[PDB]
């Protein structure tokens, strides 16, 4: 059903530029670092797995955390509270059955009360002005997936595993829009599994060439080669499963020949 596809694609291209976090925000946080953010996102990866939430819910929650931290200074003892209210809000926007609030409170181990979570939910909605329908790497991957000749299950899981790895590291991934990370991820996955490249039909559909993708690809290639030694490991653990064709066990290409 392609009728609306191109319109939606254009509209997402426009909303990603407007839903985008401000790039150097961490530099203005007096108390939190990219590392503490990395530990937080790795934790929501696990919360997602525990509750069986969509990958899309995770990527929304990340987008809401980086937009909130874009205008609100937060002390370290409260970062998990922003992150839990964001996971709850993303669950309410996207899941058919979101976890209940008392479950969100249990997964923090009573670090916060129910009342804190509920008040942080109201502050996140106000700071984001309720604008929750954001474009994610996942939304662009799934559209890119329709141009594969023929469909390859392994390429898809791996493009997903890469797009998810990007969420952990604000530096360098806050520099890149969702659609560009998705394109770098889909090219790297394809290249790794079948030796093919970012397709000519995606070039026309996104205007992106392997040259405009290069900076993001070089970063994502170094993240993929160093994934086994990163401090956060829940995404590699999750992509070992058979649901994902165990793609996090594949070995990354040594070079991209770019």
């Amino acid at each position: 059903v392609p009728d609306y596809h191109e319109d939606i694609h254009t509209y997402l291209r426009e909303m990603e530029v407007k839903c985008k976090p401000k790039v150097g925000y961490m530099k203005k946080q007096p108390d939190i670092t990219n590392s503490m953010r990395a530990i937080l996102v790795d934790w929501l990866v696990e919360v997602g797995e525990e509750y069986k939430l969509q990958n899309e819910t995770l990527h929304l929650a990340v987008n809401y955390i980086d937009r909130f931290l874009s205008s609100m200074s937060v002390l370290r003892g409260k970062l998990q509270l922003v992150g839990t209210a964001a996971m709850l809000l993303a669950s309410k926007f996207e899941e058919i059955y979101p976890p209940e609030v008392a479950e969100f409170v249990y997964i923090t181990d009573d670090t916060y009360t129910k009342k804190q979570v509920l008040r942080m939910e109201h502050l996140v909605l106000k700071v984001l002005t309720f604008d929750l329908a954001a474009p994610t790497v996942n939304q662009f991957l799934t559209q890119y997936f329709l141009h594969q000749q023929p469909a390859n299950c392994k390429v898809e899981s791996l493009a997903m595993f890469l797009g998810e790895l990007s969420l952990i590291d604000a530096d360098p991934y806050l520099k890149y829009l969702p659609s560009v990370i998705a394109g770098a991820a889909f090219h790297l996955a394809l290249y790794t599994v079948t030796g093919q490249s970012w397709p000519e039909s995606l070039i026309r559909k996104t205007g992106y060439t392997l040259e405009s993708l290069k900076p993001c690809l070089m970063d994502l290639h170094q993240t993929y080669l160093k994934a086994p030694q990163h401090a956060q490991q829940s995404i590699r653990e999750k992509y070992k499963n058979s649901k994902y064709h165990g793609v996090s066990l594949l070995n990354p290409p040594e070079t991209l020949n770019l």
Partner: protein
């Protein structure tokens, strides 16, 4: 907070509270206030309200009600909307003797299709289109409203909530339990409403899901693999379903012309992949002469 609004009368009622007609005491603006009750030691803001408000903020179109403001207090949440004369169900009920004039039926459908095609182009499924959720003003406009069941959808779609759309306007791929549904379910709802505006009564008034399916089968013919490939493998399909033959639309919607019949059958096509889109529906020859009459209120 709600300091500046004066409640004038109850316009409707729903799930999370009440719906009032109110006026801004400072500017005179007449508004519809939709109260969503919260509390605490509950689930916080209702996911239906979080979707309604964020989807409405992205749906700026002449045929989509306008959200004017959101008053998010500690105790309550109020959605502030532009107030329109009444919903299409009340207008229909008031016109059951006369009927709605032909040109206004065509104008209403063309505008419903333009607001629906804007929704779909912004990756939003409505999923609750019925006459009481559509709003008319005194000058001839009609608008989509009640975005309380809506959702941002993905390309390609994943599985979504099964309990969607008010029974009479529910698509057969939902009733048969299909793993996937998409924009074709809103088109089906609009086909139902177009007929209802024409004949002055619900096209498929079921009283349960099997009854709803059987009303559809009796009018359009029980679908088989030629009309809808995959039908007989659907989760709630039963090969013992009675096999009825399709009825001629001259009996189904007698007052409708050839062009209107053609458009209605493309909106009610069994197979969702073949059902007409809102955007192609906008180019059908039924709309070549469309005008904007004013309702007789």
């Amino acid at each position: 907070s709600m300091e500046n609004f004066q409640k004038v009368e109850k316009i409707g009622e729903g799930t999370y509270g009440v719906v009032y007609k109110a006026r801004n005491k400072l500017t005179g603006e007449v508004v519809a206030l939709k109260k969503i009750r919260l509390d605490t030691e509950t689930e916080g803001v209702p996911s239906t309200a979080i979707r309604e408000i964020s989807l409405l903020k992205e749906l700026n179109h002449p045929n989509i009600v306008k959200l004017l403001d959101v008053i998010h207090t500690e105790n309550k949440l109020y959605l502030v909307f532009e107030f329109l004369h009444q919903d299409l169900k009340k207008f229909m009920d008031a016109s059951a003797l006369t009927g709605i004039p032909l040109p206004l039926i065509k104008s209403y459908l063309f505008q419903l299709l333009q607001g629906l095609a804007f929704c779909h182009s912004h990756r939003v499924l409505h999923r609750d289109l019925k006459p009481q959720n559509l709003l008319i003003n005194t000058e001839g406009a009609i608008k989509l409203a009640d975005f309380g069941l809506a959702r941002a959808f993905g390309v390609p779609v994943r599985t979504y909530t099964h309990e969607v759309v008010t029974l009479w306007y529910r698509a057969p791929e939902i009733l048969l339990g299909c793993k996937y549904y998409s924009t074709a379910v809103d088109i089906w709802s609009l086909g139902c409403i177009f007929a209802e505006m024409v004949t002055r009564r619900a096209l498929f008034p079921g009283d349960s899901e099997i009854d709803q399916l059987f009303r559809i089968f009796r009018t359009l013919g029980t679908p088989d693999e030629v009309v809808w490939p995959g039908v007989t493998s659907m989760p709630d399909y039963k090969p013992s379903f009675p096999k009825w033959a399709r009825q001629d639309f001259s009996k189904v919607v007698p007052p409708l012309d050839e062009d209107g019949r053609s458009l209605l059958s493309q909106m009610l096509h069994y197979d969702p992949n073949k059902r007409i889109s809102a955007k192609a529906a906008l180019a059908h020859p039924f709309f070549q002469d469309v005008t904007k009459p004013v309702p007789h209120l």
